[PDB]
Symmetry: D3
Subunit: 151 residues, 6 copies
């Protein structure tokens, strides 16, 4: 498949509320790239404290979202859409690099994650790309994550 | 006068997390109509129980967002964007009729509120319209509120 | 039966925190009616924003509670207390009508749900009734929901 | 007054969500007794973890509710309904004794607090009593509180 | 003798936001236990206890001593056995001689020191203190009964 | 010497559940800062990160380090001035050279160690590590910007 909805994400990613930051996948190409997004709404708990009266989606959380997008890409390229295998996996961050934040993200925004694979061996995946709102680069970052069996 | 953001929505509506269901206002015509929206993300608490493994934004909360939109419309018609006066008024919602649900709303949907003034007689405003997602009508509703002095 | 506790409701309704708005079933007549309620306390997250310094249970949630009650009836009427079958379904709102909010509900209130089946066929159930607090009616509503897999 | 509702409690107790455990006060006799209650509903965050699929209101939290009631009783016995002064004081427990849990408190329950004044000298208060559900004792405890300066 | 959060999760039925024991540092069957809970501002409870002045609730300090004691009593009889842990429930009958001396705030490491005072059958009575930086912030005694869950 | 949670509240705009620094144990203007945050199971973030396997988000470690530098930034600029503080916010500009070596879990005392690399006006570039029991759990570099809440 090339497009996945929230019920499909829940069967692949280990993340859960309040750390599942990818609402839908709009594009996917094995071992290559992925385009996904997360809607930003005031009705999110993080806004309670970031910041009071000035809702700003955290920058670290944008990185997380891109990372989670990559994870999806990594997992499905590996075993395809196999919920049963995905059931017992988790994803560790290994390294984060070269992130610039250019525009603040706020409620009402559609935070689009654009990720490409820079390199990958076995379970280690090096991804890089951007976060975009209304077609403008709101953030850029590259990260290396690791798919690991829960034990 | 037309485009209001979450910062402005916070200054007019008393609603706060997790009951403020309007992230942005794309346009409003005094005494006529309003178009606004709320992003629907999985990272909202309500999805924890509605329902496990099948996130579906609660039908009643669509009506609430709609009511919220009409309320911002009625208020702004009377005094415009005025936070000081807003702190002194309340909009009791008296009735709701003819609400119909056609399509479930899910994480990743841009829930758009379309409300128009149906009858403005005194302190009583009556609005109606639809909630839309991607051009389609996902819900309909009629509503009647009353403008009153806060206490 | 006719009396059900949270322990039972959990096994029938698919809802869970913070959207299971029925705490106990007091009276239940297959395909006819049901009386249940949800206790209202300040210790609910909803009150953080509805509203600050002035806690008021959302009107729309009172309808939700009425619907949930309707669904518990709709379901038991057709399969009795069947936790296994119950978990192979979910109930969803089709239409809401003639709702009125006469009295604001607040922490300390025992929001009682009174629903009777107006019409029902297959998974399609039409119910209507009131929401009550200490005898007085605080809300009225008619709603139609459907039970699906 | 002898009957106070949540808005009143809110002006007297500093406690707030999710630690304000008293919804209403039905009887208040200065320097003597107070009777209040807290509604228990499945819709409370505590039930998520106490316990999964077996909702049971924490015994220690019952005590806390008895104590907050005592605190209200203590303060109002002294300054009456004086919101400005309450804002400057705070009640701390010093001791808790003879706590006995008899019946589990569950959703749908109306946890009624019956607290009476055992001893009161200045800012130091001793109160015994019980938490009741439908006229049956579900818990009992004694505690000595202190009225201190918020600063 | 040293159990981390995961082990605790297999023994205690408590979950967020009511599992108030982060780690067991030492344990001795029928004798004592020392465990602790970290206190951080990042806890929901502080939103209301109290606004502008974070003070970990004293009743919750007691709840943590209870869970520690409950853990002590369970593992003393059955050791680290998650399976039998699901068939038994440890609830508390009485709590007595509770005393608060110092307030616990964010940044503190709330250490639980519980002793087995007496035990006969499934009735276990434990007591001890709550400590931070080697000082006593609280003390209490509790009587628990171990029963069949399901 | 030591700044506690209520001091932190008076300088940092961050609040629950995004205020991830519990205490400042060391501070030296225009040079370095050592602070920490307790990690407990009783934090909402652990419900989804990850179920049955609590791991403090690596990204939140960086956020904790960023806030630490934030406090070093406010103070180095205007000292302990709560009045000026209440008017600003902090924006993330860049993050770089981050590496996670050890997983942080409930029970850990997450210590932040940051030093100033370069600063001008409201723009600050800091770097350092996050430690647990004297071991480097993670390292990173970041540049943030303090701004008027205009
Ligand atoms: O029950 C209430 N409803 N609505 C308040 C309210 C005020 C404005 Br202005 C508004 O646009 C909307 Br709609 C409201 O619901 C209420 C009553 C008293 C105080 C508060 Br604050 C809210
Ligand atoms: O039953 C009690 N606590 N916990 C009971 C319990 C917990 C879980 Br978990 C469970 O699966 C089952 Br059967 C229980 O009875 C209790 C609580 C307060 C007072 C009393 Br007398 C009993
Ligand atoms: Cl940020
Ligand atoms: Cl629905
Ligand atoms: Cl309402
Ligand atoms: Cl308990
Ligand atoms: Cl306390
Ligand atoms: Cl991580």
């Amino acid at each position: 498949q090339s497009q996945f909805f929230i019920e499909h994400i829940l069967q692949i990613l280990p993340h859960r509320y309040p750390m599942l930051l990818v609402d839908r996948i709009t594009e996917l190409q094995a071992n290559q790239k992925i385009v996904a997004y997360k809607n930003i709404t005031f009705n999110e708990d993080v806004f309670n404290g970031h910041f009071p009266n000035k809702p700003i989606f955290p920058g670290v959380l944008i990185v997380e979202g891109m990372a989670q997008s990559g994870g999806f890409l990594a997992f499905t390229s590996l075993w395809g859409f196999d919920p049963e295998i995905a059931k017992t996996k988790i994803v560790y961050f290994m390294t984060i690099d070269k992130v610039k934040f250019r525009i603040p993200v706020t409620p009402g925004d559609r935070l689009e994650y654009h990720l490409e694979v820079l390199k990958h061996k076995g379970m280690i995946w090096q991804v890089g790309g951007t976060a975009q709102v209304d077609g403008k680069v709101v953030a850029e970052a590259e990260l290396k994550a690791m798919i690991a069996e829960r034990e």
